[PDB]
């Protein structure tokens, strides 16, 4: 089949997918929401135990099989073939949720071109009454309804939630966001139409730019006065509330979404070349660099937050407690507005966001567009371009549901419902099929001689008990404790909670309905049926 070619290009694409605008969006936000310092100490061990097996085993299976992500299960467990459609639906939901954020970032990049950025002062298009956050000398009198210029810019300019009274009420049209989505999808299509050649050609040029932007932002934030309270709040042990009512399950979900295992993209990337004697090293290097990037992102987030809190002369907690997605887009907005080096830092930060989001959504769409073609050979023969066009069509059609609605409500719903229980139980089914059903002995007997080292005594005991135990504990705790939704002082109703639970439990029903279809098409009785249907070809 197709070969990756440059090993450096392959590894760079893997680490560029590992680094995610979604991770940069979720990790520091939920960290500051749950307490800040009490998020990184019980983080690295869970990150290891949750991602290192799910990354290494998946990469090994991909490099051993090299037949895509949907048709790969035919040689392991054909009963669990519905996991391919599950991964497809989950990636579609992720792209539908991700394109709106990409459009927001690109619109911010476009609007950050004027010399007078609309973040230093509220203009003639926002509520100047609510707009009062201006750092003067004894001129601010905070009240129960005090807002910020960046908050108003995020609320009544790009999202326009003031016209939407909730999920039960529709919203107005957004032609600017529609054109932004059109441009982003055109770029994605022009980058994904050719194939793996352009895949490797576009990633290597947008890979070091986010890193250099992160480094220059860190070295800039390390100079502004007031970067001490932020790091002190970011480095507090706080051993009080991590035993039972802790945020461990949200940290696990976040690191899972950041490393992105079981999303089919890693399996599809490993399904190209054999990649001998480098699977373990690739997995470890990718996970380490992703964890380091997430740590640097959280560090700069908390540095900027502490600088803002010290300039405001108030605690770090009160700054954007209810703003879920708006936290970043108001904090960095006010940071650029306060720093005397504006009109360039905002531009480079938005360009870093655009590059990261492009790389992430490109890998996410590729992990499906190169996996469905293996299941559909008649399509893969000639109609690859038409199938790419059709999947782009349906992707932006699904994104239009959130676009026309004009609100981040569906965005938050997909943020804490799509990439949560659905992909969690998908990874659980994958791990169960790899460990219990498929023999770990014969699964490792080949990678042993392929990598020259013995993977025993760590994965032989991690893949069987601790990883599935944690991955099931997280999901049962999630199903037991309803994650109440809050956004912009708007409590989501019980009907919204029920709809979220329904979409979460239906985003993976394809696997059991395919199991039932296979059981009803296969004749006979239960025992012989299962013993001749669970046959790794």
């Amino acid at each position, epitope marked *: 089949r197709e070969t990756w070619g440059k090993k450096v290009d392959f590894l760079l694409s893997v680490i560029g997918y590992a680094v995610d605008l979604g991770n940069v969006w979720r990790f520091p936000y939920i960290c500051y929401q749950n307490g800040g310092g009490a998020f990184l100490l019980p983080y690295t061990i869970m990150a290891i135990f949750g991602g290192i097996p799910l990354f290494y085993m998946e990469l090994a299976l991909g490099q051993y099989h090299r037949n895509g992500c949907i048709s790969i299960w035919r040689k392991i467990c054909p009963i669990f073939k519905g996991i391919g459609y599950a991964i497809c639906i989950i990636a579609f939901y992720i792209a539908s949720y991700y394109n709106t954020i990409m459009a927001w970032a690109l619109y911010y990049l476009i609007s950050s071109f004027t010399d*007078q950025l609309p973040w230093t*002062s509220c203009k003639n298009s926002w509520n100047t*009454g609510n707009c009062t956050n201006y750092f003067s000398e004894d001129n601010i009198t905070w009240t129960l309804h005090s807002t910020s210029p960046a908050e108003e810019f995020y609320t009544r300019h790009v999202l326009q939630i003031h016209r939407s009274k909730g999920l039960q009420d529709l919203g107005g049209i957004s032609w600017q966001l529609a054109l932004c989505i059109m441009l982003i999808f055109t770029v994605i299509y022009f980058s994904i139409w050719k194939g793996v050649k352009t895949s490797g050609k576009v990633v290597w040029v947008t890979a070091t730019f986010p890193y250099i932007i992160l480094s220059v932002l860190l070295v800039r934030g390390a100079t502004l006065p007031g970067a001490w309270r932020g790091v002190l709040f970011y480095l507090k042990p706080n051993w009080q509330k991590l035993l039972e009512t802790g945020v461990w399950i949200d940290a696990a979900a976040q690191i899972f979404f950041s490393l992105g295992p079981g999303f089919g993209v890693l399996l599809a990337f490993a399904s190209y070349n054999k990649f001998n004697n480098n699977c373990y090293q690739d997995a470890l290097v990718t996970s380490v660099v992703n964890c380091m990037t997430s740590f640097v992102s959280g560090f700069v987030i908390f540095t900027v937050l502490g600088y803002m809190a010290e300039m405001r002369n108030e605690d770090v907690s009160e700054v954007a407690k209810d703003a879920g997605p708006s936290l970043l887009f108001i904090t960095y907005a006010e940071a650029i507005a306060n720093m005397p080096a504006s009109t360039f830092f905002a531009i480079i930060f938005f360009l870093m966001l655009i590059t990261l989001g492009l790389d992430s959504t490109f890998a996410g769409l590729e992990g499906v567009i190169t996996a469905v073609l293996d299941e559909f050979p008649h399509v893969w023969a000639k109609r690859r371009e038409r199938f790419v066009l059709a999947v782009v069509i349906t992707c932006f059609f699904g994104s239009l549901v959130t676009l026309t609605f004009g609100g981040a409500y569906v965005v938050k719903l997909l943020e804490e419902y799509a990439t949560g229980p659905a992909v969690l139980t998908v990874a659980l089914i994958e791990a169960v099929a790899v460990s219990w059903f498929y023999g770990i002995t014969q699964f490792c007997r080949d990678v042993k001689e392929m990598l020259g080292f013995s993977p025993g005594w760590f994965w032989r005991i991690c893949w069987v008990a601790i990883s599935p135990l944690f991955l099931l504990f997280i999901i049962c705790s999630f199903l037991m404790s309803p994650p109440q939704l809050r956004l912009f002082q708007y409590n989501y109703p019980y009907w919204s909670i029920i709809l979220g639970y329904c979409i979460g439990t239906s985003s993976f029903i394809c696997i059991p309905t395919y199991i039932a279809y296979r059981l009803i098409i296969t004749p006979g009785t239960f025992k012989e049926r299962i013993i001749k249907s669970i046959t790794p070809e």
Partner: antibody
Framework: QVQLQQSGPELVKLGASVRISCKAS????????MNWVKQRPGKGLEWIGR????????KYSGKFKGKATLTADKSSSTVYMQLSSLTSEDSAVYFC??????????????WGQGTSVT | DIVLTQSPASLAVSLGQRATISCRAS??????????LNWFQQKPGQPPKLLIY???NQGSGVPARFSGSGSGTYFSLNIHPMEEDDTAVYFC?????????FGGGTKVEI
């Protein structure tokens, strides 16, 4: 409240320059715009320009940017309008309005007494 | 610069009947769901007085007899039958950026 007090009447000569003051008080004048209108005797209203005290943002229009200039004073809470090349055509009475907030549509709720500059 | 036009120019209606004031333009001033339009009450000698908030809401201190609605290009000012003192000229103001222009003016008399 309604405290947009202005000065008395001025004298107009061919090629002169006058200054019209506008004392603002009773609200956050550092975050609200200040508008200036022009009304001729027996004619309708004409817009001159707007000024945002606190940031110096000015947006002149109405073919008046060549002879009018707005200046804000946060220390004295006054709004000044610099005039130049006065003529009997534009010699009329000028007011001093105050724009509302964003959700209110920037409506001139509070007005001044009026400077009968003739 | 966006120009506003008013029609009719004079309304010689008596006491006891309602009237309508029109303020048309190429815009389409609707932005963020807020119709940028303001109606003023200018009496001879007296400064103008604000009547309508964003062409949909009533102002402060104005009696409930003043009202009006509209969307996009077409804007109307449905006024209750006026009294012997409510006779005055009315202007419509467009507050959409970046330039602000006033209307012509109607001669509401009895």
């Amino acid at each position: 409240q309604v405290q947009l007090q202005q000065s008395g009447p001025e004298l107009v000569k061919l090629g002169a320059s006058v200054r019209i003051s506008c004392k603002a008080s009773g609200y956050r004048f550092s975050y609200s715009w200040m508008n200036w209108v022009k009304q001729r005797p027996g004619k309708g209203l004409e817009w001159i320009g707007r000024i945002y005290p606190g940031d110096g943002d000015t947006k002149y229009s109405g073919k008046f940017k060549g002879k009018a200039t707005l200046t804000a004073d946060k220390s004295s809470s006054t709004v000044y309008m610099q005039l130049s090349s006065l003529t009997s055509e534009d010699s009329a009475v000028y007011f001093c309005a105050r724009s509302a907030y964003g959700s209110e549509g920037f409506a001139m709720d509070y007005w001044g007494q009026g400077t009968s500059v003739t | 610069d966006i120009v506003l036009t008013q029609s009719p120019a004079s309304l010689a209606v008596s006491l006891g009947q309602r009237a309508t004031i029109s303020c048309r333009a190429s815009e389409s001033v609707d932005n963020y769901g807020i119709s940028f339009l303001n109606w003023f009450q200018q009496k001879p000698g007296q400064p103008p007085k604000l009547l309508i908030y964003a062409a949909s809401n009533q102002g402060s201190g104005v009696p409930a007899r003043f009202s009006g609605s509209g969307s996009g290009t077409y804007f109307s000012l449905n006024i209750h039958p006026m009294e012997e003192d409510d006779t005055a000229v009315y202007f419509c103001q467009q507050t959409k950026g970046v330039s602000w222009t006033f209307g012509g003016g109607t001669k509401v008399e009895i």
